[PDB]
């Protein structure tokens, strides 16, 4: 099955009358991977009118497959003989409803999946090729009869109003804007689709949205959809008026010469898109002094500064739970020394000196790290300030071997 593509790319004589019928029998194989490869090499074969006409006259059954089979069945609408056979059992009227409610937005996911598979290293569960998938709105405008239906149902009015009035706040209503930009760019890929698209004056609206848009993701989507508008000589003249150039040659000759077009368009000056309005930064809108003139022994010969009755482990339970007040000048001058060493430990200028000054207190007075009120004050300070990790583990671990009897006594009583 993989070897049927080399017979397609090499222009084997009369491939369209014995090769297509050999790719239809291979379509009904038991292994899914084999059948999924027969859909890939059949989509590539459909780009020749002789091959596409062959498939229509064979009328194969592609409904039993997945989304890949569905997209291959939507190419039948581009041929007048294939549109009349499908728009005779009532099928395009069912796709139009089914392409409006459910998976008009899913076409964005198909676009995003291939791009994320090409260059993102995402792998949803060497230069590749990313080809635009088939769209129902982009294949129905090839002939006048199909284009007539797209106008009586009046979808263009609904799509156009979604572009002139975008709400770029919610992440779910932005995707509806992408679901309309990708649908407006496919209607503009044909001359018969541009007659009913430029009568509402929507191309200037997209061009404005491609240079002044707050969400930079939409600003990049408009670049892609403007290429689809530049697939015809009539479409490249409209873009030229608004200072947007385009490539006016096909891909069959990779050596352009000055005297169908591939879809590509860029602004004349590349800096007309990269301008972003500036948004201001959000930030734009005591014992410490006295201790440095004396010593710890000299002074000895309420202390909790930021201790209020909402940010303490014990004192917050007096009212809500019904706890009892904590019980008890020699211990009030040690709380200040313990705290003032914590702040000095937040600068890391002289860590060893401050660590030494904290270990001595736990030796001479090991019972000063035995009050929950000090733990809450230290813990409240460890959040606002910024400490290094080794200095953060030194603290919060000096308190490991404590009983904290006051909580246990009160918690036992209130629960009992």
């Amino acid at each position: 099955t993989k070897h049927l593509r080399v017979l397609l790319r090499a222009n084997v004589e009369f491939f369209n009358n014995w090769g297509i019928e050999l790719l239809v029998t291979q379509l009904h194989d038991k292994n899914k991977t084999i059948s999924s490869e027969a859909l890939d090499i059949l989509d590539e074969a459909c780009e020749d009118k002789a091959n596409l006409h062959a498939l229509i006259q064979m009328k194969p059954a592609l409904s039993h497959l997945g989304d890949k089979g569905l997209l291959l069945l939507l190419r039948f609408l581009s041929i007048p003989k294939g549109f009349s056979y499908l728009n005779e059992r009532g099928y395009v009227a069912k796709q139009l409803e089914k392409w409006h409610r459910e998976y008009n937005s899913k076409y964005v996911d198909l676009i995003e999946e291939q791009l994320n598979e090409a260059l993102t290293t995402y792998r949803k569960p060497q230069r590749p090729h990313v080809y635009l998938p088939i769209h129902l709105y982009g294949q129905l405008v090839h002939h006048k009869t199909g284009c007539h239906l797209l106008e009586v149902q009046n979808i263009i009015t609904e799509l156009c109003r979604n572009v002139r009035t975008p709400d770029l706040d919610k992440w779910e209503e932005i995707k509806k804007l992408k679901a309309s930009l990708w649908a407006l760019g496919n209607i503009g890929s044909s001359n018969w689709g541009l007659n009913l698209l430029q009568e509402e004056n929507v191309i200037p609206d997209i061009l404005k949205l491609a240079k002044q848009c707050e969400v930079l993701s939409i600003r990049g989507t408009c670049v892609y959809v403007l290429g689809l508008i530049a697939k015809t000589k009539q479409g490249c003249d409209i873009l030229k008026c608004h200072n947007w150039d385009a490539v006016r040659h096909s891909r069959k000759h990779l050596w352009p010469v000055v005297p169908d077009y591939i879809g590509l368009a860029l602004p004349v000056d590349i800096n007309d898109i990269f301008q972003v309005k500036d948004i201001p930064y959000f930030q734009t809108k005591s014992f410490h002094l006295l201790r440095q003139q004396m010593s710890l022994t000299e002074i000895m010969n309420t202390g909790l500064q930021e201790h209020t009755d909402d940010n303490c482990l014990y004192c917050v339970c007096i009212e809500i739970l019904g706890f009892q007040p904590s019980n008890q000048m020699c211990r009030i001058l040690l709380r200040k020394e313990v705290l003032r060493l914590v702040i000095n430990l937040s600068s890391s200028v002289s860590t060893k000196c401050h660590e030494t000054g904290l270990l001595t207190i736990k030796e001479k007075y090991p019972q000063t790290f035995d009050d929950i009120c000090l733990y809450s004050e230290v813990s409240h300070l460890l959040s606002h300030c910024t400490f290094r990790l080794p200095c953060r583990r030194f603290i919060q671990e000096l308190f490991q071997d404590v009983q904290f009897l006051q909580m246990h006594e009160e918690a036992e009583a209130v629960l009992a």
Binding site: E112, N116, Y122
Partner: protein, 35 residues
């Protein structure tokens, strides 16, 4: 690329970390049960 909405970004964050971590921690701490 079109890594724009948070729906795919959260899926990208919690899949690359689990798959490409040598230590057996991300496969244990990023359990989908905690959503």
């Amino acid at each position: 690329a079109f890594l724009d909405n948070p729906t795919i970004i959260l899926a990208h964050i919690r899949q690359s970390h689990v798959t490409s971590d040598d230590t057996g921690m991300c496969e244990m701490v990023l359990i989908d049960h905690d959503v």
